[PDB]
Design an enzyme around this catalytic site. Structure first.
Site, PDB file in Angstrom:
ATOM      1  N   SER C 127      -0.577  13.531  -3.650  1.00 35.70           N
ATOM      2  CA  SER C 127       0.606  12.814  -3.174  1.00 35.70           C
ATOM      3  C   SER C 127       1.882  13.381  -3.784  1.00 35.70           C
ATOM      4  CB  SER C 127       0.492  11.332  -3.520  1.00 35.70           C
ATOM      5  OG  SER C 127      -0.715  10.813  -2.997  1.00 35.70           O
ATOM      6  N   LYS C 153      -0.269  14.935   0.947  1.00 41.16           N
ATOM      7  CA  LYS C 153       0.529  13.796   1.373  1.00 41.16           C
ATOM      8  C   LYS C 153       1.988  13.996   0.977  1.00 41.16           C
ATOM      9  CE  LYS C 153      -0.779   9.638  -0.018  1.00 41.16           C
ATOM     10  NZ  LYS C 153      -0.999   8.592  -1.081  1.00 41.16           N
ATOM     11  N   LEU C 154       2.900  13.971   1.950  1.00 41.75           N
ATOM     12  CA  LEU C 154       4.333  13.964   1.626  1.00 41.75           C
ATOM     13  C   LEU C 154       4.957  12.580   1.805  1.00 41.75           C
ATOM     14  CD1 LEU C 154       5.515  17.126   3.671  1.00 41.75           C
ATOM     15  CD2 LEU C 154       4.770  17.212   1.262  1.00 41.75           C
ATOM     16  N   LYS C 155       5.656  12.126   0.774  1.00 40.80           N
ATOM     17  CA  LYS C 155       6.554  10.984   0.902  1.00 40.80           C
ATOM     18  C   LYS C 155       7.731  11.400   1.796  1.00 40.80           C
ATOM     19  CE  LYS C 155       8.766   7.078  -0.392  1.00 40.80           C
ATOM     20  NZ  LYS C 155       9.330   6.918  -1.777  1.00 40.80           N
ATOM     21  N   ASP C 180       3.634   9.717   4.011  1.00 44.26           N
ATOM     22  CA  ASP C 180       3.678   8.308   3.656  1.00 44.26           C
ATOM     23  C   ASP C 180       5.089   7.815   4.004  1.00 44.26           C
ATOM     24  OD1 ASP C 180       3.587   5.787   2.520  1.00 44.26           O
ATOM     25  OD2 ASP C 180       3.150   6.492   0.495  1.00 44.26           O
ATOM     26  N   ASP C 230      -2.005   0.591   5.850  1.00 49.20           N
ATOM     27  CA  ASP C 230      -2.201   0.336   4.430  1.00 49.20           C
ATOM     28  C   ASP C 230      -2.171  -1.177   4.180  1.00 49.20           C
ATOM     29  OD1 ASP C 230      -0.441   1.553   1.408  1.00 49.20           O
ATOM     30  OD2 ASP C 230      -2.125   0.143   1.655  1.00 49.20           O
ATOM     31  N   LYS C 254      -7.918   0.382   0.163  1.00 41.75           N
ATOM     32  CA  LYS C 254      -7.777   0.102  -1.265  1.00 41.75           C
ATOM     33  C   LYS C 254      -8.687  -1.065  -1.629  1.00 41.75           C
ATOM     34  CE  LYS C 254      -3.093   1.889  -1.671  1.00 41.75           C
ATOM     35  NZ  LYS C 254      -1.659   1.748  -2.021  1.00 41.75           N
ATOM     36  N   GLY C 282      -4.925   4.873  -3.656  1.00 43.67           N
ATOM     37  CA  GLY C 282      -4.789   4.764  -5.102  1.00 43.67           C
ATOM     38  C   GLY C 282      -3.662   3.843  -5.543  1.00 43.67           C
ATOM     39  N   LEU C 284      -2.570   3.992  -9.199  1.00 42.11           N
ATOM     40  CA  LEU C 284      -2.275   4.402 -10.572  1.00 42.11           C
ATOM     41  C   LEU C 284      -3.303   3.833 -11.561  1.00 42.11           C
ATOM     42  CD1 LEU C 284       0.401   6.059 -11.036  1.00 42.11           C
ATOM     43  CD2 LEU C 284       1.274   4.029 -12.127  1.00 42.11           C
TER      44      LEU C 284
HETATM   45 MG   LIG Z   1      -0.079   6.411   0.321  1.00 46.15          MG
END
Ligand SMILES: [Mg+2]
Ligand SMILES: CC(=O)N[C@@H](CCC(N)=O)C(=O)O
Ligand SMILES: CC(=O)N[C@@H](CCC(N)=O)C(=O)O
Ligand SMILES: [Mg+2]
Ligand SMILES: [Mg+2]
Ligand SMILES: [Mg+2]
Lengths: 370, 360, 360, 370
Positions: C127, C153-155, C180, C230, C254, C282, C284
């Protein structure tokens, strides 16, 4: 003009009930009342939390809401100056969910703001009804006829709707058996998010018995299945738990999940959002009516002012305060007669904490400043 | 506390443009203050169905006798006291909007604040008519971009649409660009309108019939450029129907067309509940109407720029004492209670064609 | 045979990042073993609605007294013993997931194996946050491609989406690339999002409201890039509704958000029955949560790479004794019963802000 | 930990019946029982095939299934080591259809695996019910009243659902005539894939007679026409033959082909896939119930453990073993009382082959090794 919020009190009271409230999510006998008082410009706004000790009706709890108030919401507003309640509400960041917690702040802000203007609350929200039609909701009880009698005591009082809390293994009976004795009364059920689409054909039997609506028959957070069920039965569905915002209301009505919305002010996050829910419903030609959460006279009075708006076209759950408490936290009586509740007079909510009596039932009390 | 409407004046002004414009005003008097609103109906039924002649008749013969001498809790109560009658939303808006201004002035509170707004400035866009050719279009867009306008509206028409849009987007790849189709198209034009899609317009305004939603819904399936509704949204239930049918994704919200501020806020809230933005449309208003517009525009779903540009672009001299001047595409909210603007009574008198007073 | 829950500890740790992170743990004791799970709620309600304060209240006042001293046939029975209460899925997941770990350890069986998985390794993605410009984006993607990650994954955000995606796809024509969208968009952004379509993203994650499915369904009709859900999938019935409405074609799964492993497997199976893939999101996590995630990820419809990258990317030092380190985009399943990881009790104590024990 | 499958026995038995089973696909009096026994780690898993000698209920046959077992499935697994039943199932390549054949292997693997752990089967699948509600399905019989009597014998036994196998030229009669004597019983029909959309209006007549569902009224392999028929009648449809996987279930429910699924474990390919079918239905708010295929106590016990899962909300076809056989192939009785069947205790299925008695009714027996 503008208003500065200088202090905030959180006061938690517990009030003994009178009748036992035996819903399908459990039995309720006593009542914790979380009050938020905001201070500014020589006046005060008071609001009441509708969250429970435990997440039984919906997802919030007193514990989590007070943490949120003291750690986040109150710090964002204390010492700040606002042009109106919408700006207070704007200042509580982008935090997710927790509508009832937000409502304590927002609704107190409405009360405070209206009091700075010397204007009644309902008036500022656009309502001009001078009293509101109310019904009663009757918890789970007794049997086929020996419950047509508790309905009796309320029809004799002139209540304009009778609502029966049903649940899996107790439903079709009272309805024909109340439509029995009272063939002409406005009658409804609170199917108590009890059922699933499995239970659909049984519910259709309630159809001939001519209810105004069946309330939240399926999951508390559902819209989609309700829209399916609505296609299978002729009795309109009413949503409660599943509409927590004006966009939820839009989606529910566009989907056909219901034709009526039980509007609970604190559930949708306060007065401004309730007006939006109310107007969205109206634009779809759907009525709203005012839900109740066993409130003290603070919450009850907020409900009455909101109920003055024009799309409140069905009787609400705002019956007489004397029904619930031997003594309320406010000075004023809030008593309906013949199914009509008058708007309590004065600025904001038009009601006033009975501080001496409140003190005798207070179990927690904090002050917060900037 | 409540307010009694004791008196009403109708003043019809002929305000020189910078040719003239007829500006019908209603002033409502009560509690030692006054509310002022401006009518947006024309002499003939061109933009929509109402006229000055029909509207003033309705005011003096019906709306005014209904409210004169009566006491009201709020502007919604005033409006409700007129709800038996059908349509005529601009005539009704005159009473309703003056009532909002009066009410706000009894409280000492800015109008936008009472409606729930908390912006101190509103973003403004510019409207361009048909130019002779592509480069003439681009030169005027460049001017207006340099003045700091935050939206460019081009008037388009059959025969002249892809060309100006293309030339403009080529010169200005990132600006907010929209067009006004002025109900001049039909469903047979779908292929031509779809040619606009590659230039990423924010919306095309009312391409099909002025009172239509259903054919707009069909057209929206055929092209990817969003449709903006104007004349076919005259109420909150129209806004709901429009958004739910997919007639458009944007609403040009004109306060008087929908019947005033309360209903405008309901249009704004319905749109918001759909996650659709609104913007403030214009009708060549004197400063009275412009100020009502600026105040309405402070609400949070006014997320695209509005036609509340500088009064000086329209009038040699305005009917109010306050200048409404936008700077860098931001119009300041005029300060004070209600609309925050004040009729210049002596200047007004020099341009008055007719006036009348009514009491109970 | 059945298991009795005799004791529970709540330990709240403050784990230094490599600023700190609050890590709430629940340890359930029974039959001579223990189950450990990690809460994913924050101090304030930002990613979703729950908080550490509200969750710990619910555990000690409601969930823990409901299970302490009781005997259970399986983790589903433990969870059922809490089913009267509404929402609060992450609080519930703490109990449910510790119960899975305890149960698996009474049997001596790896957790993933009990849930039906038979992968020995799971594919991991990376990410990336917003970078300053296009080339800075491409340089970091190149790094991560060289490390062997199997998904990028790109924000993205309004104003910065097509540019980084374009630059990346140009430099990397064949990689698995996703974005994302972080609920930062609206339906008015459809035209801009459709511009991503030519770069063949595997999905765009939750572009519209965090709790929405219906508007996502509308957006999916307007663009060809698949939507990944999500926050609006918190249960198997949400997954069903999402997939059947066409709200998306992929679910970021999740474990704690949906209420634990059993419900996660149901989300996974519902998705599978629609032929839609899931992947492991995820939050963290310390090694406790990361290990629960790795075990869940061994199930066969986890067909896109997950955010269970190396513990060393987040923590100077982890709360468990085992290193969870991915090599060439493959994370090994930690060996042993249940999660296969073990709290380092002494290190834990050096970073504990608060602890408590509960018995029946 | 891991398990190695070292040997496999195929044992075919035939068991005399007791009542004559006169379905719309024919009359059944006797019963061939194909057993698969898997050996490993000192324990054994046993499962039972539900395929017939001839393809009458569905497409598989004993003959073709044993060929598939001996030539393909068993060779792929013998001598191999697996972490769980999902891995066994994974190892049987991409072969098409033949779910019942696959189920013999897969379900034996579940039994074997659970026995290596010393845990009951249902427990590992997530169920925690200690007994399951059962009904009876009654084949085709007699006449209008002289069949309200066979229903009688079962209602007196406390069975919680009565299912009548109907068919073209015998249907509406018993239903009103059973709703006659027994106005309050849970009642259903097994419309026996007999009809077509042609027969739609007649079926709507069953509507007032208040059945929980009509089972598989149209073609055995159909979803689309069922979705059409479901729109024409108010009685929910139940699918059987047409749902052979979790994706079939998803498609059936998304289409609206039914509101209830008869879940037959071997028909969908075993326990793991049955749990998925069960969870998929649940996610749509559709109940499942447990079908029966005249099983010996091996199959019956597998069914009972599966039925412990929470979306088994309607009584299944798992009635008392003593109803079918004078002597069963296992030692333990599987007898329901008052419509409740207890879960047989012990690891895996909790039941045990009666090897001495099995030998006296065995007609084929092979051992297979790596
Ligand atoms: Mg994400
Ligand atoms: C606490 C709340 O959940 N109780 C009632 C409302 C009671 C009403 N009569 O005030 C309810 O039905 O939701
Ligand atoms: C062999 C099988 O096809 N027979 C029955 C089920 C019999 C049940 N009562 O065990 C059926 O209806 O399918
Ligand atoms: Mg209720
Ligand atoms: Mg325009
Ligand atoms: Mg059958």
């Amino acid at each position: 003009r503008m208003f500065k919020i200088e202090a905030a009190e959180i006061v938690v009271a517990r009030l003994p009930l009178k009748f036992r409230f035996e819903t399908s999510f459990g039995v309720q006998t006593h009542k914790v009342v979380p009050l938020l008082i905001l201070h500014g410009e020589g006046v005060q706004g008071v609001a009441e939390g509708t969250m429970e000790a435990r997440p039984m009706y919906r997802e919030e709890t007193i514990c989590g809401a007070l943490c949120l108030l003291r750690g986040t919401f109150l710090p964002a507003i204390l010492g700040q100056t606002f042009a109106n309640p919408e700006a207070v509400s704007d200042a509580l960041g982008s935090y997710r969910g927790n509508r009832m917690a937000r409502a304590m702040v927002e609704m107190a802000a409405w009360d405070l703001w209206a009091r700075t203007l010397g204007v009644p609350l309902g008036t500022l929200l656009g309502g001009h009804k001078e009293q509101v039609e109310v019904g009663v909701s009757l918890g789970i009880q007794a049997d086929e006829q020996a419950t047509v009698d508790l309905v009796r005591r309320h029809v004799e009082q002139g209540y304009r709707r009778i609502k029966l809390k049903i649940k899996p293994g107790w439903d079709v009976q009272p309805v024909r058996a109340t439509r029995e004795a009272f063939p002409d009364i406005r009658l409804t059920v609170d199917a108590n998010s009890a059922y699933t689409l499995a239970d659909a054909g049984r519910l259709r039997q309630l159809d001939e018995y001519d209810l105004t609506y069946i309330e939240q028959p399926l999951a508390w957070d559902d819209l989609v299945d309700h829209a399916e069920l609505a296609r299978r039965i002729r009795t309109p569905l009413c949503l409660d738990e599943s509409v927590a915002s004006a966009s939820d209301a839009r989606k529910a009505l566009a989907l056909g999940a219901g034709g009526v919305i039980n509007l609970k002010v604190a559930r949708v996050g306060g007065h401004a959002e309730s007006r939006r829910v109310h107007d969205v419903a109206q634009s779809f030609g759907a009525p709203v009516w005012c839900g109740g959460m066993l409130e003290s006279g603070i919450g009850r009075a907020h409900n009455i002012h909101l109920s003055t708006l024009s799309n409140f076209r069905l009787p609400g759950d705002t019956s007489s305060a004397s029904r619930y408490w031997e003594r309320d936290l406010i000075q004023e009586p809030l008593e309906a007669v013949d199914g009509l509740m008058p708007v309590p007079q004065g600025p904001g909510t038009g009601v006033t904490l009975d501080r001496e009596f409140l003190a005798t039932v207070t179990e927690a009390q904090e002050e917060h400043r900037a």
